[PDB]
């Protein structure tokens, strides 16, 4: 028939003629696939057709319906156990491809026939069915239950476990894999057949076939989280197994076992159960962190696997260094002596990795050895071999903190110079490594960098030429980080001349939709703040563009909201980025921003940003609010009545940084808002006191909450003072740590004003207030008067002897400062 015309198109596909039949077959799909499965089911000639069909399914299945679809299915399900291993393989790949495209609802007959065929006497049908059943379980994020199976998991689970005893290795694996796909769901049928699973796994532990061993490891790894109570009685005898499983040849099992320590570590039980094993485990982990023929691929596009035994082992080490801290060192230091100085480089660098790996965890116990080691790493920076350079960068950044705490000549100066050299290194993986490492250094070595800005700017600005996409993104990070870590020092005509010009090309080059703006504008926002008024020439185009991004993504979001099908949602990261720059413009331009704000529709925009579903959007616009409130309250005031109800419904601790910026804005609002703030206080005050008192909020939020309450008090003590008796305790506890800035002075004026309206609400906890006033080292000559009268008020009220009685719970400086400075 016309099948003979098809049998020529397939037998021609099997270098120029290829692309000719390939576009001839993929196009004949309009007229089709009834011939495709016909050829397969009634060798390499007909195995190809089944795979051609497979690619028709994958590319256009909705154009299929019941005529062919049902014949395809019925045809290959009868051939699921064909004894020609290539055909069975073709059918199996097909079965599973149909079954992930057309969901499970469209083929309900499937799974129950597969679960049935596992009991075939013919091995080929058993192995075929079990194979596809594994592929379906696994390639299904949603699990599998009695609905789709046509058996209770109460019958199906023990039946899998039964096959753990099948002679054929191929099946036992299929078996373990299937059962494995039920450990996460913590499904009941398995939880009840649990001791059977365990006992069964243990039996399969010493298998020969590598796949079974991987599946057993992968199992024991999972069970560790889900069901720790059963494994614990066998822990030590099963640790030693996993320990042999890492050294195990066949890396795919070695890796699958290595995960054990990653997850085991994250368990409370770990520290006490594992101590005895560290002598044997640590060496094994360090040996895994070395390299192999990875080099061959890594030197000659230069990329290997995203996750592998080296990373796993390293990650294992990182975590283990955090669980045990210094007690880990006696297990590593000796081995680290043997590695760090070594003729064979592939060995030396693994030691360098180890060194960085354990940085965070062992830092304290690692301070002694640093004066020896830091300079050693600094000479390694200029090693002959690239892979030995890149990682000493990283390892050095891991110690950036200490380096900065020592005299800036000994370590900082040599490190910084060698880094700026490495940043411009010949190969990419060193640039990236060294550039990232330098950004970590900036963060730590703050103004200590001002001596070198000229050279630092020379380097970075030069890389803009050298670097390409990948590494360019990290350069933005490093440039922005500089601006942050140095601030205004950067604002000098000489510097703006190097730095800005390239940043603007990138700006004019990139179109509005280009996701490349993210790292640029988060860079430019840090520049814009650091240069201050220095930015003026550049601000008018920068400002207008951000508002348009914000307008646009809002507009786009509205459309999508009205009609999700006809219009698409926008990438909100675009405004999260735009907002954050306007914010940093508002901060560095202060007053000079007003006209731009006045003319623009920024405040109308911000009001929908604050109402946005996404925290990050909200978070950015609140920070922007506070910034504008400080900069040009002239324009913000005319709608404090609209913002406050939002700010109030946003004082929610579960979104910690949205809440943090809210609290901050409110505080800054009041300063500008004077007495007028009073009708708004009820909106915010109660939940504000909730946050100051609810436990386990980060200090960063508490401190801002404390500042804000004070400031709200200062300006409106009548409405804020009633509550006083409830927040003073955590309030002082928090603001006792802060240095005597203006933030603090504003906050303490708040309570001092609130005390002399409601002194009754402070006596019960007057200790905290006294610690808090012994926090001050230099108060304004009128604030110490506010402390004076308030403390004397407590001395005259309580009395000479009854006040002497009170000071007995005071460390001497606190008492001596509260007596000499205030006269009490």
């Amino acid at each position: 028939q016309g099948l003979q015309q098809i049998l020529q198109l397939l037998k021609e596909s099997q270098t120029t003629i290829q692309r000719t039949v390939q576009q001839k077959l993929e196009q004949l799909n309009q007229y089709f696939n009834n011939y495709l499965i016909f050829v397969l089911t009634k060798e390499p000639t007909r195995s190809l057709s089944g795979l051609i069909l497979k690619n028709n399914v994958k590319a256009h299945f909705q154009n299929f319906p019941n005529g062919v679809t049902d014949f395809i299915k019925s045809e290959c399900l009868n051939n699921i156990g064909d004894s020609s291993p290539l055909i069975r393989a073709t059918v199996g790949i097909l079965i599973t491809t149909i079954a992930s495209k057309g969901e499970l609802q469209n083929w309900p007959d499937l799974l129950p026939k597969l679960c049935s065929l596992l009991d075939s006497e013919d091995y080929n049908t058993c192995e075929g069915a079990f194979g596809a059943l594994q592929k379906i379980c696994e390639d299904s994020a949603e699990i599998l239950d009695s609905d789709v199976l046509d058996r209770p998991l109460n019958i199906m689970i023990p039946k899998f476990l039964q096959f753990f005893k099948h002679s054929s290795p191929k099946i036992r694996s299929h078996a373990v894999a299937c059962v494995n796909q039920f450990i996460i769901s913590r499904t009941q049928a398995l939880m009840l057949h649990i001791d059977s699973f365990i006992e069964n796994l243990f039996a399969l532990a010493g298998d020969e076939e590598p796949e079974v061993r991987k599946n057993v490891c992968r199992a024991l790894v999972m069970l560790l989280e889900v069901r720790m109570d059963r494994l614990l009685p066998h822990m030590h005898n099963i640790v030693e197994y996993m320990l042999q499983r890492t050294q195990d040849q066949d890396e795919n099992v070695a890796l699958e076992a290595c995960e054990f320590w990653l997850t085991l570590a994250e368990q409370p039980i770990c520290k006490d159960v594992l101590v005895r094993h560290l002598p044997k485990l640590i060496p094994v982990l360090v040996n895994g962190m070395k390299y192999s023929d990875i080099d061959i691929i890594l030197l000659k596009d230069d990329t290997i696997s995203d996750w592998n035994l080296r990373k796993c082992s390293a990650a294992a080490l990182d975590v283990l260094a955090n669980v045990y801290r210094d007690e880990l060192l006696p297990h590593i230091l000796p081995l680290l002596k043997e590695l760090l100085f070594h003729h064979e480089w592939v060995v030396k660098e693994s030691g360098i990795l180890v060194l960085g790996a354990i940085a965070e965890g062992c830092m304290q116990g690692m301070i002694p050895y640093l004066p020896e080691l830091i300079p050693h790493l600094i000479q390694c920076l200029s090693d002959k071999k690239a892979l030995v350079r890149s990682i000493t960068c990283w390892t050095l950044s891991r110690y950036a903190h200490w380096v900065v705490s020592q005299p800036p000549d000994t370590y900082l100066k040599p490190l910084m110079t060698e880094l700026l050299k490495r940043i411009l290194d010949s190969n990419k993986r060193v640039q990236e490594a060294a550039c990232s490492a330098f950004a970590t250094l900036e963060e730590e070595a703050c103004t200590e960098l001002v001596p070198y800005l000229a050279y630092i700017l020379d380097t970075l600005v030069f890389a803009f030429s050298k670097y390409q996409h990948k590494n360019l993104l990290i350069l933005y990070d490093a440039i922005g980080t500089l601006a942050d870590s140095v601030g205004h020092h950067l604002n000098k005509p000489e510097y703006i001349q190097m730095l800005m010009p390239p940043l603007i090309q990138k700006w004019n080059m990139l179109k509005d939709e280009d996701k490349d703006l993210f790292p640029l504008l988060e860079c430019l926002s840090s520049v814009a703040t650091a240069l201050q008024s220095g930015f003026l020439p550049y601000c008018e185009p920068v400002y207008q563009r951000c508002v348009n991004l914000v307008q646009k993504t809002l507009a786009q979001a509205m459309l999508n909201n009205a009609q999700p099908d006809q219009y698409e949602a926008p990438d909100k990261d675009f405004m999260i980025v735009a907002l954050d720059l306007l914010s940093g413009l508002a901060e560095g331009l202060g007053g000079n921003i007003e006209q731009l704000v006045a003319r623009s529709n920024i405040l109308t925009l911000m009001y929908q940003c604050m109402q946005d579903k996404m925290p990050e959007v909200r978070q950015s616009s609140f920070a922007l609010l506070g910034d504008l409130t400080k900069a040009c309250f002239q324009h913000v005031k005319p709608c404090i009545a609209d913002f406050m109800p939002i700010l109030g419904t946003n004082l929610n601790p579960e979104f910690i940084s949205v809440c943090n910026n809210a609290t901050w804005a409110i505080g800054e609002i009041s300063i500008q808002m004077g007495i007028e703030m009073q009708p708004y206080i009820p909106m915010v005050l109660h939940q504000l006191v909730e946050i100051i008192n609810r436990p386990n909020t980060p200090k960063t939020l508490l401190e801002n909450t404390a500042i804000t309450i004070g400031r709200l008090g200062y300006v409106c003590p009548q409405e804020v003072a009633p509550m006083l008796q409830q927040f003073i305790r955590p309030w002082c506890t928090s603001l006792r740590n802060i240095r005597d800035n203006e933030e603090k002075d504003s906050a303490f004026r708040g309570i001092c004003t609130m005390i002399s309206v409601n002194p009754s609400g402070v006596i019960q906890d007057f200790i905290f207030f006294c610690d808090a006033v012994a926090s001050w080292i230099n108060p304004k000559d009128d604030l110490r008067d506010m402390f004076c009268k308030i403390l004397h008020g407590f001395k005259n009220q309580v009395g000479d002897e009854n006040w002497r009685r009170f000071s007995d719970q005071f460390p001497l400086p606190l008492k001596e400062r509260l007596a000499a400075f205030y006269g009490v």
């Binding site: 995203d306 996750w307 080296r310 990373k311 796993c312 390293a314 990650a315 990182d318 990795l353 960085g356 790996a357 890149s390 990682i391 960068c393 990283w394 990236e432 490594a433 550039c435 990232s436 490492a437 950004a439 970590t440 993104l473 990290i474 933005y476 990070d477 993210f518 790292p519 988060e522 990261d573 999260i576 980025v577 954050d580 914010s583 901060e587 990050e616 978070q619 920070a623 506070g626 910034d627 940084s657 943090n660 910026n661 901050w664 960063t700 401190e703 801002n704 500042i707 933030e743």
Partner: peptide
């Protein structure tokens, strides 16, 4: 005390999990 989009710094052992 106000308070991102990136963190593409170099790591030897980042887990794609």
């Amino acid at each position: 005390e106000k308070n991102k989009r990136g963190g593409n710094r170099f790591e030897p052992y980042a887990n794609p999990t």
